Scaffold this active site. Structure first.
Site, PDB file in Angstrom:
ATOM      1  N   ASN A  69      38.662   7.620  11.210  1.00 49.59           N
ATOM      2  CA  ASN A  69      39.930   8.333  11.316  1.00 49.59           C
ATOM      3  C   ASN A  69      39.697   9.842  11.274  1.00 49.59           C
ATOM      4  O   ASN A  69      38.645  10.316  10.849  1.00 49.59           O
ATOM      5  CB  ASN A  69      40.877   7.936  10.181  1.00 49.59           C
ATOM      6  CG  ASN A  69      41.091   6.444  10.110  1.00 49.59           C
ATOM      7  OD1 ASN A  69      41.374   5.807  11.126  1.00 49.59           O
ATOM      8  ND2 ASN A  69      41.009   5.886   8.914  1.00 49.59           N
ATOM      9  N   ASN A 100      41.725   0.617   5.672  1.00 50.71           N
ATOM     10  CA  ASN A 100      41.376   2.033   5.583  1.00 50.71           C
ATOM     11  C   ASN A 100      40.763   2.374   4.225  1.00 50.71           C
ATOM     12  O   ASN A 100      41.342   2.080   3.175  1.00 50.71           O
ATOM     13  CB  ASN A 100      42.663   2.846   5.803  1.00 50.71           C
ATOM     14  CG  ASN A 100      42.422   4.311   6.077  1.00 50.71           C
ATOM     15  OD1 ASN A 100      41.340   4.838   5.858  1.00 50.71           O
ATOM     16  ND2 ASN A 100      43.460   4.990   6.554  1.00 50.71           N
ATOM     17  N   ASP A 118      40.833  12.174   9.394  1.00 50.95           N
ATOM     18  CA  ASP A 118      40.627  12.735   8.063  1.00 50.95           C
ATOM     19  C   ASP A 118      39.255  12.422   7.469  1.00 50.95           C
ATOM     20  O   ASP A 118      38.952  12.917   6.380  1.00 50.95           O
ATOM     21  CB  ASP A 118      41.763  12.302   7.130  1.00 50.95           C
ATOM     22  CG  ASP A 118      41.689  10.822   6.751  1.00 50.95           C
ATOM     23  OD1 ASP A 118      42.492  10.386   5.903  1.00 50.95           O
ATOM     24  OD2 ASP A 118      40.870  10.079   7.332  1.00 50.95           O
ATOM     25  N   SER A 165      38.178   9.284   6.729  1.00 44.32           N
ATOM     26  CA  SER A 165      38.180   7.903   6.283  1.00 44.32           C
ATOM     27  C   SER A 165      37.792   6.988   7.440  1.00 44.32           C
ATOM     28  O   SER A 165      37.698   7.407   8.593  1.00 44.32           O
ATOM     29  CB  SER A 165      39.551   7.527   5.728  1.00 44.32           C
ATOM     30  OG  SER A 165      40.544   7.613   6.732  1.00 44.32           O
ATOM     31  N   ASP A 208      38.175   2.757   9.009  1.00 49.40           N
ATOM     32  CA  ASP A 208      38.862   1.471   8.991  1.00 49.40           C
ATOM     33  C   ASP A 208      37.867   0.359   9.276  1.00 49.40           C
ATOM     34  O   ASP A 208      37.067   0.462  10.216  1.00 49.40           O
ATOM     35  CB  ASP A 208      39.980   1.424  10.023  1.00 49.40           C
ATOM     36  CG  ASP A 208      40.711   2.722  10.123  1.00 49.40           C
ATOM     37  OD1 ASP A 208      41.328   3.129   9.118  1.00 49.40           O
ATOM     38  OD2 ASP A 208      40.666   3.327  11.202  1.00 49.40           O
ATOM     39  N   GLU A 243      43.791  -4.613  16.453  1.00 50.86           N
ATOM     40  CA  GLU A 243      42.996  -3.767  15.565  1.00 50.86           C
ATOM     41  C   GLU A 243      41.507  -3.906  15.848  1.00 50.86           C
ATOM     42  O   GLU A 243      40.776  -2.912  15.834  1.00 50.86           O
ATOM     43  CB  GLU A 243      43.257  -4.128  14.103  1.00 50.86           C
ATOM     44  CG  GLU A 243      44.657  -3.759  13.621  1.00 50.86           C
ATOM     45  CD  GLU A 243      44.873  -2.270  13.418  1.00 50.86           C
ATOM     46  OE1 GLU A 243      43.952  -1.469  13.676  1.00 50.86           O
ATOM     47  OE2 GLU A 243      46.016  -1.916  13.047  1.00 50.86           O
ATOM     48  N   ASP A 272      52.961  -3.233  -0.421  1.00 52.09           N
ATOM     49  CA  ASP A 272      53.036  -1.882  -0.969  1.00 52.09           C
ATOM     50  C   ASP A 272      54.311  -1.129  -0.597  1.00 52.09           C
ATOM     51  O   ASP A 272      54.408   0.074  -0.859  1.00 52.09           O
ATOM     52  CB  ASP A 272      51.760  -1.084  -0.667  1.00 52.09           C
ATOM     53  CG  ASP A 272      51.784  -0.378   0.682  1.00 52.09           C
ATOM     54  OD1 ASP A 272      50.826   0.373   0.956  1.00 52.09           O
ATOM     55  OD2 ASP A 272      52.700  -0.592   1.513  1.00 52.09           O
TER      56      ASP A 272
END
Ligand SMILES: [Cl-]
Ligand SMILES: [Cl-]
Ligand SMILES: [Cl-]
Ligand SMILES: [Cl-]
Ligand SMILES: [Cl-]
Ligand code: NA
Length: 129
Positions: free
Chosen positions: A46, A59, A48, A50, A52, A35, A101
């Site tokens: 990203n 994110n 969209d 957003s 990270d 990462e 989650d």
């Protein structure tokens, strides 16, 4: 801060990630390598809009507030900048919520594509732990 491999493994163990939700420590070191290359200051945008953040590339769409991801959540209740600190506490605490989650470590695409099903213990080999 760019962590060494065993330095990161030690910090992750101290913060309770070893076997957290059943994921041995090597899984967490592996995902951090791919990462962020162990760099706490890593950021990536990203598609969209957003972003990270940090060593685990958490994110802003769901987990932290950066003030520029319209419609997003802040489920870890932190500013995204806290995920860039030289101390990994905030990243670890937020990773514990993410991995809990429902999707486990599949929440990190890089874990699924590059760590899952490999010899992740190799990432902690040689470390004094
Ligand atoms: Cl390495
Ligand atoms: Cl391991
Ligand atoms: Cl926002
Ligand atoms: Cl730390
Ligand atoms: Cl799981
Ligand atoms: Na957000």
């Amino acid at each position: 801060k760019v962590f060494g491999r065993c330095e990161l493994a030690a910090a992750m163990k101290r913060h309770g990630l070893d076997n957290y939700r059943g994921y041995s420590l090597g899984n967490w070191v592996c995902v951090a390598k791919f990462e962020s290359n162990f760099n706490t200051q890593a950021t990536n945008r990203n598609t969209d809009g957003s972003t990270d953040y940090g060593i685990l590339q958490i994110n802003s769409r769901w987990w932290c507030n950066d003030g520029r991801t319209p419609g997003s959540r802040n489920l870890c209740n932190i500013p995204c900048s806290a995920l860039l600190s030289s101390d990994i506490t905030a990243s670890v605490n937020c990773a514990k919520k993410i991995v809990s989650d429902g999707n486990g470590m599949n929440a990190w695409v890089a874990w699924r594509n590059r760590c899952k099903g490999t010899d992740v213990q190799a990432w902690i080999r040689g470390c004094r732990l």
